[PDB]
Structure formats: structure tokens, C-alpha cells
């Protein structure tokens, strides 16, 4: 496993990790921007003959050295532009990409905006609606935000509380700092930026969409409807919002099998 | 409200209830066949200018006096034929119908099989897949089945434990007796009878489909995909499998608004 940093001319100094040799697979974090959530799965995926790259997101975790514009008023299109910049810097010319949540919005924006660069995209639980209870956290003090959101993650959406806790002290210390950055920068601007206003733009694209099997139906009901309208492959992963944390082996297998499916079609 | 019994030529003695004056709305129970679950909603719906009819299902609750054929090897098409028989007996020529679970399968079979008789159908959480853990209960002793399924209803699918328990001792005593009848007669034969093989047969039909907002996505994921493929209205009700129990006011409002929509479209 390579663990290193790289600076892109948009002002971001990224923390990134890479393992393996073969076709490129890129794992984009969810909104919390913390790539140690992929630790187990990176090794499992790489062992099947892929070069796997992941990174902390701008302003989050070890990628905190970044201009304010990269972690405020954040949109899918902004994040896609940042991910392309690190792929450029790492000389990754063609990639399979995974993303959940804001990361899902990001990888759909990548596929649509950079079709020559993206082999296929896997998106999971893509937020398309403003949720006032999340948006309203942006006006609380930092410690309040961290307390509230740490609880929501553990108890409401982790899909596996033991696995979530087992991320460890250092990871949760980084997440503690990320929660206010995410709250102030993401929930009011990510959902309106969802690249799903044109179902016909999605039709025929190499997109595989998932929702968590245990997620309440309401939460990403809209994803299932939109994917089906567009004729996009739509299915389920175990758990809820963090399948790479709750079920890392199943997650790794899904990423490998999906990449292999598109390498055959390619 | 009328509370009475009526016998049909097929050998069933039905317990039925009826309240109100106006266009007919018929509430078909779920597999447990117990129409007291509609008690609150019947009055709320009737008060908006509808004649509302409901009944216990054959072999269940107060409609137990019925031939074994009617509660063994049960299919959507069998249940639809039985519901038509009581509508005939009650001189209900045109009806709006609601059904959940096996009742959902029933109302779609009614709409497709008897289009002259059905104004519109509301289906909720329609089972299309065999579930071994439910099917396998059919070989257990009666009291084992009742204990197991009572627990599943309360803890896994009620969508409101307080409301579920508040059905009261009389209702739960009837359900306790129904669980083995349901287990032996329904889960092995109801899902393969689902009238959803042909999406094109559903297209353009006056069908409104719902799933519970809190239901785990995996439970009726297939409903959302099928409805969307067929261009059928698909949406959510609060709770899980029994919105008429957990949220009777919202349930009543949905039934009234949906019936009104189709009366206009008529
Ligand atoms: C991990 C995740 O990305 C950030 C933590 C929040 C969470 O898990 C709540 C459940 C999923 C909703 C996300 C979401 C919802 C919104 O209404 C707006 C958003 O921008 C996100 C967003 O940016 O992802
Ligand atoms: C209320 C319900 O009608 C009967 C009680 C069981 C329950 O609530 C499990 C959750 C929903 C699955 C139903 C279901 C599932 C199957 O695999 C087969 C069925 O025939 C039903 C069936 O007959 O409905
Ligand atoms: K696993
Ligand atoms: K209610």
C-alpha cells in the first residue's frame, strides 16, 4: 500500500492511497471524506488484479490543506472537477469509479462530464432532495454538530454499529473534525446539484446503481425510480449507507464483479 | 355501521361491515384476513361521502365458516374470485378497491380480471418472491406458528408497535387463530400467483401502488421497479406493512384522495 500526498494546481494537497497493478479502480468517499473506510476493501479489490486508488476529500481528514471554495458551497460538479484533477496528477487515464452519497453525485457527474476518462461508475444512495434537518445543522456550533452527526452515523445509517465503532479512535477523531466542515459545506448545495434532471442522459450509460438493503425505503426511493426510468441497472448491497464499512467483503466482491463485467463489455 | 354475515354460492359465510353512502370503496384485508384493522379508517372514509365495505377473509376470523379450498393453496386469482362473489351478493356493481400483501395481489387480479367492476385499485406491498423462512413455518405445530408469527408482526412489520398492540385482546385472539391458517395456505402459493408477469398488462391501468416509508428497502424493492417499468403511480405511506393500523388517518386520507382522483378522471 502506497500512502502519500500529491498537490494539484487548484490548491488542494491530497492525501491518497494506492495498491495493486492492473485496470484502475477509484474509490471516492462519501461526504465525510475519509478514505480509511475503504482500507479492508482496497486490499481485497487490488488482489484481484486491479490498481486501486482512494483519497481523503478536500478539506476533510488528511486532505485538509485546500482552499475554502473546495469545501464550501460544494456541488457534484465541483467535486467531479477535483477528482479529475487528482486522477490527472496520478496519471490515471481510464478509471472505474465508486461513490456513495455526495460521492455518488460525484461519480455520475464524472461519467457524464468525462466519458473518455470513465470506464464505468458505481453509485450508491445518491441524495437528490434537500433535507431541512441536515441543512439546519449548519448553523450550530462545531461541537454540537459533531455530537449530533456522530450519533446519526453510529445509530441511524452505519448499517453496522460494531463495524462503525471498529474504524477506531484515530478515524473517529478525524471524523469529529470533518462533521462541521461537511455540515456547513454540503447538505444545502449537494442535493440540488444531483446530475439526474435528465433521465435520457443516463440511458445507455455504464452506470450501476445501488441502495442499502436495510435502508428505510423512503430514504432513497427516488434513486430506484430514477434508475428504472433510465433503464440503469439498480440493485441492493447489504447494510445501509456505508457498505464498505459494514460489509467490506461483499462490497469488494461487488466492485470487482462490476468492473469485470464492464471490462468484458469494453 | 352495518355488521353482519352473508353466504355466497361458493360455500363461504362472510363476516362483513359496511358504512356510508356514495361510490363504493372496498377494503380487502392482508393475509391475516382481519377487517377490524380497518375500523378507524372505515368511518373516516365513509364520512367523506363513500359507501365503505370490508370483510374478514375466507377461513379467517369471523369468516372462518368456509370450504377448505378457500384457505388452502391460496392464490391471488382464487381470492379475487371470492371477493367478486361477496361484491355480487352485496349488489356492489362498481368499486374502488384497496389491498395489502395477499390483498394487494388480490386487487390487481380483480382490476385485470374484472375491469368492468373495478373503478381503480390501490395495492400496497405486494409479495412476488417466495420467502423460505415464512414458507417453512407451515410444518410447525399450530401454537408454535402463532407464537412465531405474532412476534414477527409486532416486531418486524407492524410499522407501529403501540398501535399494533392497541388492536386489543379480542382482535389479537382472532389473529392468534389465523396465523396457522395463513401459514399453511398462503406463503407457498401467493407469491408465484402475483399478477405482475406482464408489465405491459399493467400499463395505463387505474392502479396506484404504495410501499411503507419505513419498510427496509429490500422487502418490496421489486414493487418499486415493477411499478416504474409499467408507468404506474408509485409512492409511499407512513409506517410499514399495515398503514391502516399504524397511521389510520393518513391511510384514510390517501384512500379518499385516490378515489376522488379517479372519480374525476372517470
Ligand atoms: C456520509 C454522508 O455523505 C454525509 C453524512 C450525512 C449522512 O450520512 C445522512 C444520510 C445520507 C444523506 C446524505 C446527504 C443528505 C442531504 O440532504 C444532503 C447531502 O449533501 C448529503 C451528503 O452530502 O451526502
Ligand atoms: C400480513 C401478511 O399478509 C401475512 C403475514 C406475513 C407478513 O406480514 C410478512 C410480511 C409481508 C409478506 C407477506 C407474504 C410473504 C410471502 O413470502 C408469502 C406470502 O403469501 C405473503 C402474504 O400472504 O402476504
Ligand atoms: K462482508
Ligand atoms: K394517522
Numbering used by the authors:
A (entry chain A), B (entry chain B): 2 to 267
Sentences copied from the publication:
ZEN is a resorcylic acid lactone that is produced by several Fusarium species as an oestrogenic mycotoxin. Zearalenone hydrolase (ZHD) is an α/β-hydrolase that has been shown to be able to detoxify ZEN. Structures of apo ZHD and some enzyme–substrate complexes have recently been reported. These structures reveal a catalytic triad consisting of Ser102–His242–Glu126 inside a ZEN-binding tunnel that is enclosed by the α/β-hydrolase fold and a helical cap domain.
In order to obtain the enzyme–product complex structure, apo ZHD crystals were soaked in 2 mM ZEN for between 1 and 45 min before quenching in liquid nitrogen. The conjugated coplanar structure of ZGR was comprised of an entire phenol ring, an adjacent carbon double bond C1′=C2′ and a carboxyl group O12′=C12′—O13′. Taken together, we suggest that these interactions are altered as a result of the breakage of the lactone bond. It is very likely that Trp183 N∊1 is responsible for the unidirectional translational movement of the phenol ring, which in turn determines the conformational change of the lactone loop following cleavage of the lactone bond.
